[PDB]
Design a binder for these strands. Structure first.
Lengths: 60, 32, 144, 51, 128, 95
RNA sequence: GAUCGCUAUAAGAUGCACGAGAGCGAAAGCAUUUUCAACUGUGUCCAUUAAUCAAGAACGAAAGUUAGGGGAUCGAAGACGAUCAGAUACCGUCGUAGUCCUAACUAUAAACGAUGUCAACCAAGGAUUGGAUGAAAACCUUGUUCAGAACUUAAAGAGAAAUCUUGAGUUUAUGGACUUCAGGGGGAGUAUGGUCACAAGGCUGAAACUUAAAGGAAUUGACGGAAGGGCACACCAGGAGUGGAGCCUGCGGCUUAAUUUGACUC
């Protein structure tokens, strides 16, 4: 019950210091855009795995 | 005004535009 | 089951109400549902087992910053408007011109309402006030 | 208080209002106030009494 | 229970708490009311979107069980004399409800603005 | 001397204007001295605007917008980044 | 049986959005609808009736006093809960006076445009409120002109400079008319005297003594638990560690006849 996602673009770094990436993933299952907070090295081409796509982590 | 004009003799057009008391010779604007 | 004692009733039928039949119940229904059309969506109606009210979105979406708010009482509200050839930013009516508008703003309304909407007519009829000041948006916001 | 709906009640306020706002200034005026009442005016304190 | 029916949802989510309150159309008789602080164990987490997201999910379950397959949303914030802006969990609750296969009808703002207001807490100099 | 020509407020021919309450700290501030901003915001944010349309019982329902006018004072108007400190010759900018 | 939701009832207060460098008012001030002031128009009347004003008088925010009514919201004093070394404060909850109306007092404010009142001249420009006069046929566009709140530019005038230009211009090239105030800083708006007020207090109001500065506008620098833009193993993700144990060594301390001395955050 884990739904993967494909990164499309990177919106910058947040979280006080630079250790957290705000990327704009999309879900190849149904083409539903989702914005998630990511920790670690990421490029646009790489994909991601999420155990919860229901939370739109816009961070206000 | 900065552009000085003759005021001892005023133009006929400029007289009819000034305030009735501010003309060279104040005249009423009333008829009859 | 704390809901095993509840029997649903009914009220175009626009909805259902749950009871434990008692029914000074007041029910609000959008005019779009009542008239099965989306043109009357910015209105509300109240029924007692009552009244009508302009929706909050439409009340705040018709008030302009640089006009004069004309309001009377069946509540009615109207606004002065700009012109196609108008240049100046501000279009305000004098205190005397407003009283001319208000002397026919509701007087016209009370004329037909007492003698006798959901189509148009009277809200737009009172705008032509136009002979004293240009007016565009006129609504009957609430009826008690 | 909860009362039956058949109780009669005259509408309005009772006349002679604001009577006590006037300061009785003397002893005599307070003594004449009890002309048509009981006998309780000159009240001697308990602590000014024998045991 | 019944067949499909139309209800209303009065989501009152301020900066401190989130109320998910769904009644019938008349607004007199309720079905379920789950609060933001009902499903958390910290007084500072009552306004979090996750607290309101979880609350909205369980409201749909009880509304499905009664056949209330749609809801008229009336969204409000504590706008009497205080801030009229709905808190953080206000928008999260609406998104979570519609994600549970709930048909969403009218969305309206019922934040009561003061036509004429009384005094506001704080004094002249405000909350320093 | 005078840091501002109009003394910060915007009243010229009147000797008194009714006070208003700041929207952030609730501080009594005059009507003209206040910082007035008009906010137009949809109740459903853009991250969830399409979520409603997938499951909406209506047919051509257009989501309304919130209409609130916010008034701030200087103390939390600057602190809230609504306005900033400007240069001496850049203060006269009024657009 | 709180919070929350619909419907009703009564009083208190309030007058959002429209609401503006817009209007009126001598000032204070004036915001729901259903006696007075000013401008303009004027081939109307009087003829110097005029300006400023010691003494004198009216109005005079908020708080405050006295007696009634009202007492919903907020809330000097006060009570709790936090924070802190303490906090008797900022933050949270409650609450008497007060906040409201009437009648009578008090007469002070950053009562500010810190700019007295009347009068003549005064560069350029956009725009606004209320009228009069033309074209465009009440509203909208435009021309002339009177009054009003303001604004932009100035290579000019003034100033110590900031700035002012509907003057803070026409001033050492000094005089249009009138009233008030000030003479280095403290003492001090204190004492005494007089007078007004139910009271708090207001109006008038020095000296003895003490002291080389107090103060005004702008420059540079420094500083900010002010903002904006960049940078650093400064930090994030980590590796090795030191601090813990024995020992080499340096420093302080104790000791001694001497335990030689410089260096003491980076």
């Amino acid at each position: 019950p884990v739904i993967y996602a494909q990164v499309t673009e990177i919106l910058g770094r947040t979280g006080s210091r630079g250790g957290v990436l705000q990327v704009r993933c999309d879900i190849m299952g149904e083409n539903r855009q989702i914005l998630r907070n990511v920790k670690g090295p990421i490029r646009v081409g790489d994909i991601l795995t999420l155990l919860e796509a229901e939370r739109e982590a816009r961070r206000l | 005004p900065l552009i000085e004009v003759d005021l001892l003799n005023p133009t006929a057009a400029s007289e009819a535009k000034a305030h009735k008391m501010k003309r060279l010779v104040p005249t009423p604007n009333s008829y009859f | 089951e704390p809901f095993s004692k509840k029997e649903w009733y009914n009220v175009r039928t626009v909805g259902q109400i749950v009871v434990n039949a008692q029914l000074g119940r007041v029910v609000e229904v959008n005019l779009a549902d009542l008239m099965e059309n989306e043109k009357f969506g910015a209105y509300n109606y109240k029924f007692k087992c009552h009244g009508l009210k302009l929706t909050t979105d439409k009340l705040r979406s018709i008030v302009k910053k640089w006009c004069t708010l004309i309001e009377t009482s069946i509540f009615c509200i109207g606004f002065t408007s700009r012109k196609s050839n108008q240049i100046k930013k501000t279009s305000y009516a004098k205190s005397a011109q407003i009283k001319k508008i208000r002397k026919i703003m509701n007087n016209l309304i009370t004329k037909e309402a007492a003698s006798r909407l959901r189509e148009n007519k009277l809200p737009k009829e009172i705008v032509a006030c136009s002979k004293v000041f240009s007016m565009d948006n006129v609504y009957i916001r609430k009826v008690k | 208080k909860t009362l039956k709906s058949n109780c009669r009640a005259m509408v309005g306020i009772i006349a002679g209002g604001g009577r006590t706002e006037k300061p009785i200034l003397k002893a005599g005026v307070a003594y004449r106030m009890y002309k048509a009442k009981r006998t309780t005016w000159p009240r001697v304190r308990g602590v000014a009494m024998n045991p | 229970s019944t067949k499909d029916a139309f209800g209303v949802a009065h989501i009152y989510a301020t900066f401190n708490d989130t109320f998910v309150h769904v009644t019938d159309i008349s607004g007199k008789e309720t079905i379920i009311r789950i609060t933001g602080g009902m499903r958390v164990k910290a007084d500072r987490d009552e306004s979090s979107p996750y607290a309101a997201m979880t609350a909205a999910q369980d409201v749909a379950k009880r509304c499905k069980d009664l056949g209330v397959t749609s809801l008229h949303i009336k969204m409000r914030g504590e706008g009497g004399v205080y801030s009229k802006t709905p808190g953080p969990g206000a928008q999260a609750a609406l998104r979570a409800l519609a994600r549970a296969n709930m048909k969403i009808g009218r969305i309206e703002d019922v934040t009561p603005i003061p036509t004429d207001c009384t005094k506001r807490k704080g004094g002249r100099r405000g909350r320093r | 001397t005078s840091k501002r020509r109009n003394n910060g407020r915007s009243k010229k021919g009147r000797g008194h204007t009714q006070n208003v309450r700041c929207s952030h700290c609730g501080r009594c501030v005059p009507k003209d001295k206040a910082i007035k901003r008009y906010q137009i915001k949809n109740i459903v944010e853009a991250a969830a605007v399409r979520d409603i349309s997938d499951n909406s019982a209506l047919t051509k329902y257009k989501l309304p917008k919130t209409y609130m006018k916010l008034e701030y004072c200087v103390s939390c108007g600057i602190h809230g980044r609504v306005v900033r400190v400007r240069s001496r010759t850049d203060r006269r900018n009024r657009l």
